[model samples]
Target chain A: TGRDSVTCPTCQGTGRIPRGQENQLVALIPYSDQRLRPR
Target chain B: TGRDSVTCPTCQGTGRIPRGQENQLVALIPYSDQRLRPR
Candidate 1:
């Protein structure tokens, strides 16, 4: 098979990634959890 | 000071604080960093 470009899991093809410290801050919010979503 | 309510550093006196998991997402963005702010 020819070489195929797969989406990078880290950047999700966005070409941008967060630094270690940046990730530390985002871990503070619960945006995706069910609790945050409206019933 | 007698029973003076000091601002909580964790919540910054917001009353609510994000759990560990939630903070993870917010940390993804560099919103607070000078690099992200408009020059």
Candidate 2:
């Protein structure tokens, strides 16, 4: 009764999530203050 | 009639495409695991 089509474990419910890429094109990319709200 | 779904060339099925925010607000919090680099 419950199967098939599960959400992505990485992003969960949010489809097409955004993640920081290591190196390569990770230059001069600005980080939002909101991203540091955990502190 | 072909091609029901076309994968994003940039993301390549990764779904979560985080290229870079052309213009964003990066915070500079001390002790944080983040720092400004360059674009």
Candidate 3:
């Protein structure tokens, strides 16, 4: 489905990063902007 | 970095799920105890 963006580091593109990265999750990217893109 | 878990369906993996899926984003995968993985 065409309803997505990029690929996470942990999830690598699965939406299930893992269970250890919880501490480094940082922010949830509330605003859909370049501020959270390929950066 | 050894951080993070899955790649949200919207974000795909880049951590930037876009602005459109904000509403369909459902949850933020809090208690990563297996309730949010390749489901």
TM, chain A, every candidate: 0.32, 0.30, 0.23
Q: Candidate 3 on B1-39: residue-level lDDT in tens?
A: 456444454455445434445556654543556655756
Question: Runs in model 3 with CA error above 4 Å?
Answer: A1-4, A20-39, B1-16, B19-39
Candidate 3, A1-39: lDDT as tens digits:
576454454445455544434465554464455755666
For model 1 the local lDDT of residue A5 reads: 32
Backbone clash pairs for candidate 2 read A27-B38, A28-B38, A28-B39, A31-B26
Tell me, what's the RMSD of every candidate? 21.4, 22.1, 16.6
After TM-score superposition, the amount by which residue B30's alpha carbon in candidate 2 deviates from its true location, in angstroms, is 14
Off by over 4 Å in 1: A21-39, B1-39
Clashes of each: 14, 4, 15
- Candidate 2's DockQ is 0.03
Fnat for every candidate: 0.00, 0.02, 0.59
Please give, for residues A1-39, the per-residue lDDT of candidate 1 as tens digits. 544233443444333333355446435532454656567
The worst-scoring run of ten residues by lDDT in candidate 1 chain B lies at B1-10
TM-score of each: 0.21, 0.23, 0.19
